[PDB]
Design an enzyme around this catalytic site. Structure first.
Site, PDB file in Angstrom:
ATOM      1  N   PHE A  56       1.105  -1.252  -0.055  1.00  0.00           N
ATOM      2  CA  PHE A  56      -0.135   0.027  -0.076  1.00  0.00           C
ATOM      3  C   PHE A  56       0.793   1.370   0.093  1.00  0.00           C
ATOM      4  CE2 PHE A  56      -1.930   3.543   2.570  1.00  0.00           C
ATOM      5  CZ  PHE A  56      -2.734   3.829   1.370  1.00  0.00           C
ATOM      6  N   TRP A  57       1.531   1.472   1.038  1.00  0.00           N
ATOM      7  CA  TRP A  57       2.555   2.742   1.296  1.00  0.00           C
ATOM      8  C   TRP A  57       3.343   3.052  -0.249  1.00  0.00           C
ATOM      9  CZ3 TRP A  57       0.758   6.552   3.490  1.00  0.00           C
ATOM     10  CH2 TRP A  57      -0.199   6.367   4.662  1.00  0.00           C
TER      11      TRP A  57
ATOM     12  N   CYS B  81      -8.583   2.640  13.479  1.00  0.00           N
ATOM     13  CA  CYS B  81      -8.725   1.579  14.131  1.00  0.00           C
ATOM     14  C   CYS B  81      -9.639   0.504  13.248  1.00  0.00           C
ATOM     15  CB  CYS B  81      -9.845   1.897  15.407  1.00  0.00           C
ATOM     16  SG  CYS B  81      -9.715   0.497  16.594  1.00  0.00           S
TER      17      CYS B  81
ATOM     18  N   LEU C 255      -3.629  14.167  20.055  1.00  0.00           N
ATOM     19  CA  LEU C 255      -4.369  13.701  21.016  1.00  0.00           C
ATOM     20  C   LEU C 255      -4.443  12.011  20.964  1.00  0.00           C
ATOM     21  CD1 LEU C 255      -6.947  16.403  20.884  1.00  0.00           C
ATOM     22  CD2 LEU C 255      -5.128  16.014  22.273  1.00  0.00           C
TER      23      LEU C 255
ATOM     24  N   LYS D 258      -6.714  -7.854   6.935  1.00  0.00           N
ATOM     25  CA  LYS D 258      -7.588  -8.227   5.733  1.00  0.00           C
ATOM     26  C   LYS D 258      -7.406  -6.770   4.703  1.00  0.00           C
ATOM     27  CE  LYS D 258     -10.389 -11.451   8.014  1.00  0.00           C
ATOM     28  NZ  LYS D 258     -10.673 -12.568   7.057  1.00  0.00           N
ATOM     29  N   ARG D 259      -6.686  -6.096   4.822  1.00  0.00           N
ATOM     30  CA  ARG D 259      -6.432  -4.887   4.196  1.00  0.00           C
ATOM     31  C   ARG D 259      -7.501  -3.985   4.194  1.00  0.00           C
ATOM     32  NH1 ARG D 259      -0.972  -5.178   3.459  1.00  0.00           N
ATOM     33  NH2 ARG D 259      -1.162  -3.662   1.694  1.00  0.00           N
ATOM     34  N   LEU D 260      -8.224  -3.773   5.282  1.00  0.00           N
ATOM     35  CA  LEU D 260      -9.282  -2.821   5.718  1.00  0.00           C
ATOM     36  C   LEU D 260      -8.475  -1.492   5.706  1.00  0.00           C
ATOM     37  CD1 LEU D 260     -12.289  -2.696   5.497  1.00  0.00           C
ATOM     38  CD2 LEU D 260     -12.265  -3.194   8.051  1.00  0.00           C
ATOM     39  N   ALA D 261      -7.352  -1.392   6.499  1.00  0.00           N
ATOM     40  CA  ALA D 261      -6.889  -0.344   6.591  1.00  0.00           C
ATOM     41  C   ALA D 261      -6.552   0.778   5.473  1.00  0.00           C
ATOM     42  CB  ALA D 261      -5.520  -0.310   7.485  1.00  0.00           C
TER      43      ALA D 261
END
Ligand SMILES: CCCCCCCCCCCCCC(=O)SCCNC(=O)CCNC(=O)[C@H](O)C(C)(C)COP(=O)(O)OP(=O)(O)OC[C@H]1O[C@@H](n2cnc3c(N)ncnc32)[C@H](O)[C@@H]1OP(=O)(O)O
Length: 411
Positions: free
Chosen positions: A4-5, A160, A411, A168-171
């Site tokens: 991804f990155w 999160c 934060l 599962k590559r949700l991020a």
């Protein structure tokens, strides 16, 4: 390998960042019309959801997701437990953009499965002072100054994924959809922090911790006995005695901040933060939001001298769940926020922060060595933590800087 990155407009290696000498964007200029108007495809059993941060139900849903699934220590002994009031504070600063709060939920039962949040911030992020020195010595002062005006960008936090959906590559799709929504607002950079190494931080700061209840901290395995106390036959007793805080604030003019302090706190904070390479610019409205006291969330004190506010400090509360301890299930942690000292030594100002935090029942005071935080570690008996907070930009090339040049509190 970063499937991804490696596709994203960030510096890809520490070696690359080591060579960056000017601040500036990485991607070609785009316009909003280049950005898809449809949300990215997602599994048919899931849906995108934009929470309403004024709806108690929606805030509670985010609260429960983060309580049970947000950052955990590596041994699964502690997990952040941000309160609902803290989340409404952090997610809803002045002029926040509801569409920048991105969630995934399961259609069938409306269960929240993932979240990421963006809020606006105005950030000075031009070329750092020392690189400008070198640039000017090369006759490139102009290029080094191109991006000195503060920029309206996105601050990302609270990424999160539910534990049952990890890996599962949700991020990546969450991140891509947030980027789409931010880009559709004509915003093209973001800033974020992480306790993990991603491509590629521009600054990294170690965590430091000041025990306020050292017996509890040792019992729950938050901290150990400092090496300098291991020589004693009873180290905990000597720890308690040397860590004992003055009963009373050392600054007689100390009081809680009130709304009429906002303009003076703005001016002294902005004068102080101006000396750092990367830092926020705050209006009166933003000073009011981020610093006026809010029960259980943020605590702010001012020192009056000569009838005027000359110094102030702030800290905010993040409890953590303690997992697997038969004696305790919560850790009450205070985090050093913004401050400014114009009339007293900084370590005297922050001693009063520790005194107040102790009186309010906090167990520990945490900070990262940003701002001038490193300068009072030894004086006020902070110990080094194991963690490091890394600072990142999205679509902004930036030279590596020391954390002492960072004035953005996350934060
Ligand atoms: C212009 C506007 C732009 C706006 C967006 C700017 C960018 C914002 C960026 C986000 C700033 C967030 C700031 C915070 O809130 S930092 C705190 C992050 N949250 C937690 O640590 C809570 C607990 N952990 C989790 O919820 C999950 O493990 C997360 C969600 C972290 C990963 O989910 P999961 O474990 O199920 O993995 P996957 O299979 O779905 O995805 C794997 C891919 O994700 C990359 N990954 C892993 N950890 C992080 C991380 N902390 N930041 C960014 N990327 C991360 C990883 O390198 C890999 O990519 P690649 O290595 O294969 O290439």
């Amino acid at each position: 390998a970063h499937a991804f990155w490696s596709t994203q407009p960030v510096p890809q290696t520490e070696d690359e960042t080591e060579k960056i000498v000017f601040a500036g964007p990485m991607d070609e200029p785009k316009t909003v019309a280049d950005i898809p108007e449809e949300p990215y495809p997602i599994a048919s059993t899931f849906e995108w959801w934009t929470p309403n941060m004024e709806a108690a139900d929606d805030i509670h849903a985010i609260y429960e997701l983060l309580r049970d699934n947000y950052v955990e220590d590596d041994d699964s002994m502690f997990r952040f437990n941000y309160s609902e009031e803290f989340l409404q504070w952090a997610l809803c600063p002045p002029n926040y953009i509801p569409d920048w709060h991105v969630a995934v939920r399961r259609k069938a039962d409306k269960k929240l499965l993932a979240f990421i949040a963006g809020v606006p911030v105005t950030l000075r992020m031009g070329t750092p002072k020392y690189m400008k020195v070198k640039a000017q010595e090369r006759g490139e002062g102009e290029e080094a100054a191109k991006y000195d005006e503060p920029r309206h960008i996105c601050e990302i936090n609270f990424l999160c994924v539910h534990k049952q959906l990890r890996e599962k590559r949700l991020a990546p799709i969450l991140i891509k959809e947030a980027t789409r929504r931010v880009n559709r607002t004509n915003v093209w950079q973001a800033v974020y922090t992480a306790g993990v190494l991603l491509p590629t931080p521009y600054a990294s700061g170690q965590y430091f911790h000041r025990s306020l209840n050292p017996e509890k901290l040792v019992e729950i395995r938050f901290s150990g006995i400092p090496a300098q106390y291991q020589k004693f036959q009873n180290p905990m007793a000597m720890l308690k005695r040397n860590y004992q805080l003055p009963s009373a604030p050392k600054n007689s003019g100390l009081r809680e901040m009130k709304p009429s302090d906002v303009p003076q706190v703005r001016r002294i904070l902005m004068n102080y933060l101006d000396s750092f390479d990367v830092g926020p610019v705050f209006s009166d409205a933003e000073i009011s939001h981020y610093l006026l006291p809010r029960d259980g969330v943020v605590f702010t004190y001012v020192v009056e001298n000569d009838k005027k506010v000359t110094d102030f400090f702030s800290f905010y509360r993040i409890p953590s769940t303690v997992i697997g301890n038969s004696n305790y299930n919560l850790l009450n942690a205070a985090y050093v926020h913004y401050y400014a000292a114009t009339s007293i030594p900084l370590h005297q100002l922050i001693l009063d922060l520790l005194i107040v935090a102790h009186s309010r029942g906090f167990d520990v005071c945490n900070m990262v060595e940003i701002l001038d935080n490193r300068s009072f570690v030894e004086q006020l008996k902070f110990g080094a933590g194991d963690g490091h907070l890394r600072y990142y930009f999205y679509n902004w090339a930036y030279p590596k800087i020391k954390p002492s040049q960072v004035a953005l509190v996350m934060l």
